Amino acid sequence: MTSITPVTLANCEDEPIHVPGAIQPHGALVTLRADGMVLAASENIQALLGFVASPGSYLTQEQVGPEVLRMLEEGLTGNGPWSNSVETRIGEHLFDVIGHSYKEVFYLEFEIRTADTLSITSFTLNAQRIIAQVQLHNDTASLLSNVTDELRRMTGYDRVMAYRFRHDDSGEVVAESRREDLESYLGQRYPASDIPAQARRLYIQNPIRLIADVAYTPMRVFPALNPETNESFDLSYSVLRSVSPIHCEYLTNMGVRASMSISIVVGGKLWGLFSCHHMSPKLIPYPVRMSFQIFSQVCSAIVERLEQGRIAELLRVSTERRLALARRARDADDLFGALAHPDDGIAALIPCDGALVMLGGRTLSIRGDFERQAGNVLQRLQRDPERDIYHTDNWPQPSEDSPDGGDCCGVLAIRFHRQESGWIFWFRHEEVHRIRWGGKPEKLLTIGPSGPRLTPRGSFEAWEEVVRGHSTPWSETDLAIAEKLRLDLMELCLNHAAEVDRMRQRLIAVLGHDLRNPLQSISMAAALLSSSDTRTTELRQHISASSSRMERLVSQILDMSRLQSGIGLTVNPVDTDVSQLVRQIVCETDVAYPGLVIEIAIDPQVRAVVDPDRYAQVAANLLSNARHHGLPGRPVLVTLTRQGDEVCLSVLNETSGLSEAQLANLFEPFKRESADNQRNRNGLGIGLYISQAIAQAHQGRIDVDCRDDVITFCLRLPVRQAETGSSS
Amino acid sequence: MTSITPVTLANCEDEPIHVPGAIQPHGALVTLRADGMVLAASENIQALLGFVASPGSYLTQEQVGPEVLRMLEEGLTGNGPWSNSVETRIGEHLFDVIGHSYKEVFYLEFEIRTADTLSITSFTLNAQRIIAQVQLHNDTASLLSNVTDELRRMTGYDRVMAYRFRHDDSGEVVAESRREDLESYLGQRYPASDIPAQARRLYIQNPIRLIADVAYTPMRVFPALNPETNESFDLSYSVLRSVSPIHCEYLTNMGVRASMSISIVVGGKLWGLFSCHHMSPKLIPYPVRMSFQIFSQVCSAIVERLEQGRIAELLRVSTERRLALARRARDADDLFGALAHPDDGIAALIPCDGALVMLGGRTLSIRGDFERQAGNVLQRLQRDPERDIYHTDNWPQPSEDSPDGGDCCGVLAIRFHRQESGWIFWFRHEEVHRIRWGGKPEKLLTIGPSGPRLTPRGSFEAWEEVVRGHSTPWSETDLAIAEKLRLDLMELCLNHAAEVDRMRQRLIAVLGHDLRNPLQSISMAAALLSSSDTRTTELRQHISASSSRMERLVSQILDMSRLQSGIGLTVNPVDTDVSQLVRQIVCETDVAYPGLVIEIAIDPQVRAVVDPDRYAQVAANLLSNARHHGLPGRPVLVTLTRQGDEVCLSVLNETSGLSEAQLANLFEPFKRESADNQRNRNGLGIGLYISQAIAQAHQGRIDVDCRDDVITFCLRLPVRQAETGSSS
Ligand SMILES: C=CC1=C(C)/C(=C/C2=[NH+]C(=C\c3[nH]c(/C=C4\NC(=O)[C@@H](C)\C4=C/C)c(C)c3CCC(=O)O)/C(CCC(=O)O)=C2C)NC1=O
Ligand SMILES: C=CC1=C(C)/C(=C/C2=[NH+]C(=C\c3[nH]c(/C=C4\NC(=O)[C@@H](C)\C4=C/C)c(C)c3CCC(=O)O)/C(CCC(=O)O)=C2C)NC1=O
């Protein structure tokens, strides 16, 4: 739907190995339609089976015999997936005829069992042999060790190996059984490109491969495209499927002449393989490969059980320490203390060569001194501040320019208090690794008539690569522990930091209560001054003005605290003459500010049940806002009107132009722009915030209209009558 | 007389089905010691085999034939667990002699293969198909359906059913293949008591059961106890093991005459069964049950992998939805609004008939009104305040006694901000559930002369239970989503509330600056009052005193905020004559409060480099504390001494007795005891906190010594050496 077609990232995953259009010549293939019509067949069918499977026809009993027709008939007419096989003699050779269905196409694959003993061993006896062996092991090390030997005994292959994939898709030969005169491949690494993603995905679906003769010439199955869809025949589940010519080249470079492999699937991912080699052609009869296909799933389930148990036990053991630390830190007076102890603490949660706890600008290093390393990592994290977890095993080793460089190649950092910079770091020193590679990893490129070819390595001689500047990698367990600790510490930091709010509530509330009395006393004393002398009169006036200003500030503080605390404003609606109140406020404002030209259009005797103190407060806030933000010398128009069940008071004044962002933030508290406005340098900006809260408390609202740098405010309050109680 | 009185939990788990001491008479059993000696044998051994296995004797080739001893010798001399079988003829008919070892006891189980023919063993081909075909299913719903049909066609049983266990160990018939005339059991429920915990564990250990004749007579094995241990023979892995008579009664009441069942084990738990029934005796040859053991292990592994895939996909889609919400909630100005939107938000994470989001007293419902249920849940949860998550599927609906009830049956709640009461409640309305029980699940007991007996149900006719008042239970995924979202919202609350803190800091920081000017103006005007009249003089004095008190409060506010914000107290250390300062302060305090007897022991010319304003503040704080907490009329002893490079000021006064908690909390801010002290009602209690912080800022300390209700404070401040120019 995005109208885009991405391009693949790697050319090694782009071979369609599942639709080769060819089979290995040790059998014959026939493809059949859901009604039984022959669609395509392998070109050797006349030589191997003695008859021509002409497309469009149906198999005759003279051709495949009654056993194959009985099997096919039960297949085509059956329901759900189909997979069956039967033993029959066609011509003079005994054949294993395998049948399966995939994506509505039915396949019949014939393998010769010439020069072999009839029913020498059955699928059930071999399956029980292996499953009984596999179930004796409680560790994957010994499970893979013994299974590799039993598989070599049963098959008789020149070599059998257990190959385990790494987290980076590479893999290592973790177990081996081999003929004495063969060089051991145990413990060698092989790169991720040796088994491409396409194969790993396929080998989760079809657990068994066999290559009977690595020198084989593919037999083309023609027509190559299914006539009913023009699509290639999907041979994913075919046993005769022609393997990639690049892998037969890879095995020719190993000197291998037959191959077999069995998948190990864990968690829906290809966990490993059992790979078998022979230095001469070798075919394993289908009943035995069927027993191996059964074993593949039993062994996969057992390995999964073992790995899940081991991981679960490590997770439990670590959860114990994490919870104990959480308890200690919760009980301790200082978290930055309880975590920063060289005994236990966070340094003991994850294997590290030292750790550092950082919070609120306080740091402590455990088992070393890493404030330098930590600070430098933060100076790296400053480029991606939204990142909360950082882990690395290849920290750039410092240059020789100064000995201040720290060789702590491993860093694992987690942020538990983003605003206070709560950081925990775990460090690891450089661990010098040595890797035995199965052949030098030369590039997959050769140029010839085909252009560049993805040719495999020319030799598999064990090459030893020394790794420097790398530490012990942080396991998925360590990363999980680090994240769970991050969350546990965030929760504790929130519970800890939330107490600051309660303290400020108590403090401010007591201050608001205790400060009113001295101000009231001063205002009363100023009112009691006889004002006999002109000097005494001026001082009395200045004292009364300053006291009223402080009372106003204290009132604003109380209101803001009550609003932020959610208590709201306790309004007392009473029948108030809005006309008289607004006219009085305007007159007092004009007399107080003779330079402020105030125009009034106040309807007479507008009476409404409203709180006179809150309405006066709103009017004062609006006049102050118009004075501070209005253009100097411009007149202010005040219009009070009753619009049905609402009282509308409008104030219009010119401005130097207000942006839409400023208009949206007009009601925001502590607006930074107020500190820069030379006329409002002392304005807290809460005037609109408090006014809006007052309007909401009165079930009203404050409208704002700014046009052509002229802003118009319209207070709308609902008309209501106060309730009166009676005994009736 | 044992001083104990146990209480029975259940009768059905007590019967030891693994040590029955008897076998099903379709075979014979011989028990052997690790040295090959015969321990015990079934009493029918002479009837079926023609020889007597006298205890203590050894088998002989003329008795059991050579192939039996050949098989047994590999067992006795083998390592670890053993399990094998041999096809051999004894007397005139063929026996399937199966051997295994358990707890170092070796068993020989003889099963007659009479009345069949190797051609009938073609069941091995149907086994091959089922084992091979099962691997291709894409989901458990189709897998159970197809496998039940294949199992019925293969075995030919009158009925086959896939039984899946519920989370409460009950089970439901989820698939069925049956003879056309038989009553279909598909979809019926059966209680947990139908397969007791012991049977579930044994069926996890021994996957295949077969009751060839429900009407059988148990063939006792004699002697019943192993002479080597005097214990019962553990027959958990014996194929001839006599099934519980309570279960054979159960099958008799179904009209079943033979049974077979195949375990499905997932995650090491019994996930389900395939149970096959026949209305007449039927026996499955041992090679076929051997193939069913393989099928059971393969099916178990595939079912486990399919269910893991389904759970993983559910967790993936859940994670996508949750992280999308966390993003929207983080980009929002108000978290509450971005969560509370009905069109998109929290309500899409967990399927609910409605939801309520709550934070800081706000409550916004979605798809209805839910404040009643939320209120009742919190009122209940207030009795478990540490609880952060709650879930229920059967909330008690309100009685008709009041219309204020809330009719929601299911509630899921999580707390994401313990202080702001941030709660998210997901509600589910009544989902009337109709349950079809396979017979009424009445009590499985009847009392007779032997007391209560574990009588099965006498009938299996479907009884429909109308379960009312229950909603869809909260699945493991719904709980995982609630648990993870709780953390995703705790993160956002912490990161946002840090801004609320920073805002209140900015608020108080601006208030402290703007309040200073009006106070200074009033203090100056008061100082300018000519005080010509006595009344004018008294008013001036009152105004000056009130202004000084407010200035003191404002200073305390600034100090407290700077300390809580970590800014500390700014000090200006200067060479000050401590003797003169302290003497002056004491004189002023005594003159202002002649009723407060102050005793002074002030060393002369004590000089120290200290901030005179901060040190005077500390002295005033100490004197105020002694005045408010000292006993009325008792003298206060003030001692100032220089102890080398430190100046020590001590104040001693009598008290009404201070508790150890009050002494330890003497430096705490907002000490509740200050609000209750009628003499210190206006005291915030910060005096000691601020004084201690000032002392620390001066690199000094405040010592406290309270003895026999007499408290002694000792301020220790370091003396700083003076610096001056010098020349030769
Ligand atoms: C001792 C160690 C050891 C290892 C590590 C090993 C690997 C291995 N690769 C396998 C698969 C494939 N590899 C490639 C391609 C490439 N392979 C490369 O090396 C580069 C150059 C490249 C392309 C540019 C393809 C297309 C396939 C799919 C084949 C198919 O199914 O058609 C398989 C499974 C097949 C089997 O059973 O042998 C194994 C077992 N066999 C060993 O004996
Ligand atoms: C159509 C539905 C349907 C269901 C649900 C069903 C259940 C079932 N119970 C099983 C096992 C046992 N049950 C009990 C005991 C109790 N069972 C009850 O009902 C009450 C009366 C009671 C005790 C108070 C015991 C001791 C055993 C162990 C038997 C042994 O191994 O010796 C088995 C496995 C055995 C088998 O293959 O048939 C199944 C399959 N059989 C069905 O055909």
Swiss-Prot record, chains A, B:
Record note on modification: Contains one covalently linked tetrapyrrole chromophore.
**Superkingdom to which the source organism belongs:** Bacteria
Q: Could you say which enzyme class this protein belongs to?
A: transferase
What segment(s) does the record annotate as region Chromophore binding domain?
17-495
Q: Could you tell me what reaction this enzyme catalyses?
A: ATP + protein L-histidine = ADP + protein N-phospho-L-histidine
- UniProt-listed InterPro entries: GAF (IPR003018), GAF-like_dom_sf (IPR029016), HATPase_C_sf (IPR036890), His_kinase_dom (IPR005467), HisK_dim/P_dom (IPR003661), HisK_dim/P_sf (IPR036097), Light-responsive_reg (IPR052545), PAS-like_dom_sf (IPR035965)
Q: What is its EC number?
A: 2.7.13.3
Q: Where is the Histidine kinase domain?
A: 510-721
- What is the protein name given in its UniProt record? Bacteriophytochrome
